[PDB]
Amino acid sequence: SDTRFHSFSFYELKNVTNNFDERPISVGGNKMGEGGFGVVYKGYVNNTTVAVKKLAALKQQFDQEIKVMAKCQHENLVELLGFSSDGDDLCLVYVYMPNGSLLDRLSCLDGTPPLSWHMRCKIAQGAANGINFLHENHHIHRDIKSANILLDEAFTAKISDFGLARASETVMTSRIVGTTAYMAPEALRGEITPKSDIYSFGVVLLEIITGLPAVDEHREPQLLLDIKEEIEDEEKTIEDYIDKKMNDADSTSVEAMYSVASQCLHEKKNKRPDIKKVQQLLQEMT
Numbered sequence: 001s002d003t004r005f006h007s008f009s010f011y012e013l014k015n016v017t018n019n020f021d022e023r024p025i026s027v028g029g030n031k032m033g034e035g036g037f038g039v040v041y042k043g044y045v046n047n048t049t050v051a052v053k054k055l056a057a058l059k060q061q062f063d064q065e066i067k068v069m070a071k072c073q074h075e076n077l078v079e080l081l082g083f084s085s086d087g088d089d090l091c092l093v094y095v096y097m098p099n100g101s102l103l104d105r106l107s108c109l110d111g112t113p114p115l116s117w118h119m120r121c122k123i124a125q126g127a128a129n130g131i132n133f134l135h136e137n138h139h140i141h142r143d144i145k146s147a148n149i150l151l152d153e154a155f156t157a158k159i160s161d162f163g164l165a166r167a168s169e170t171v172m173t174s175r176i177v178g179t180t181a182y183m184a185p186e187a188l189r190g191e192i193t194p195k196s197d198i199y200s201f202g203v204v205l206l207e208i209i210t211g212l213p214a215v216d217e218h219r220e221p222q223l224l225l226d227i228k229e230e231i232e233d234e235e236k237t238i239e240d241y242i243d244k245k246m247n248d249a250d251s252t253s254v255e256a257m258y259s260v261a262s263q264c265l266h267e268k269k270n271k272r273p274d275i276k277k278v279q280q281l282l283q284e285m286t
């Protein structure tokens, strides 16, 4: 049923994932990808396709995701269905995302067609609506990135992986977490603020425009957020960076998304727009 969280037995989860088959799902196995603290497997429970995150050799990431995802339910957030604690290895069960991650769709992994500019604008809007819900409910995601934006059967953006998420009732931490290529200057120093999630969203918007990953060792610049400087110093234009795997992009809406991305990427946290302004600006763009 869709009305309750289901506690599953480890043996049911080991069975529906073909004994946690680590061969890619594209080869006949069950591995869909891997988060920070586990591997995500495709499963079949109640005739339904599900996603199973096996936190193998943790606990803190199990009880966090259960706590955060019991409070946060929105159409632009990934839905948790249940969990497993009995047998050896902790497991988290989710509603399966038929189109995988934004990262995989932007890189056309496994033969998928490139996302149109139209689809890209709707995904940006959906992802911002999910972030707004989290911020309205005093949650800081701390790992906003294209791998953590999932796509359902209608390409509706769903923020996922709330293992590093933080509450509130500004703050500093000794244990710095996140993805360096997406992290704000203050988040790298240890500050905990929702303004850091806005910075990270700015990198995601650049990935949507360009189709380029946030970091690439064989690229100049290595870090995607550095293209903001090349465009500001008139060495390059946004036009030079627009993903060539699209046929429907128009300069005006691309420049309007770039302006939002540029504002999000301000080095001074207080000069960045809040999520409500990001939503407003992405709505005016279409």
Ligand SMILES: Cc1cc(-n2ccc(C(=O)Nc3cc4cn(CCC(C)(C)O)nc4cc3C(C)(C)O)n2)ccn1
Pocket (backbone or CB within 6 Å): 032, 033, 034, 035, 036, 040, 050, 051, 053, 078, 094, 095, 096, 097, 098, 099, 100, 101, 109, 110, 112, 150, 160, 161, 162
């Ligand atoms: C880490 C984490 C994940 C999650 N969560 C929750 C749901 C899902 C989910 O369903 N995820 C994926 C589905 C995929 C489908 N496909 C097939 C695509 C096709 C046929 C078009 O090629 N590929 C995929 C890849 C992924 C991955 C694993 C990458 O997100 N993940 C939650 C909490 N934390």
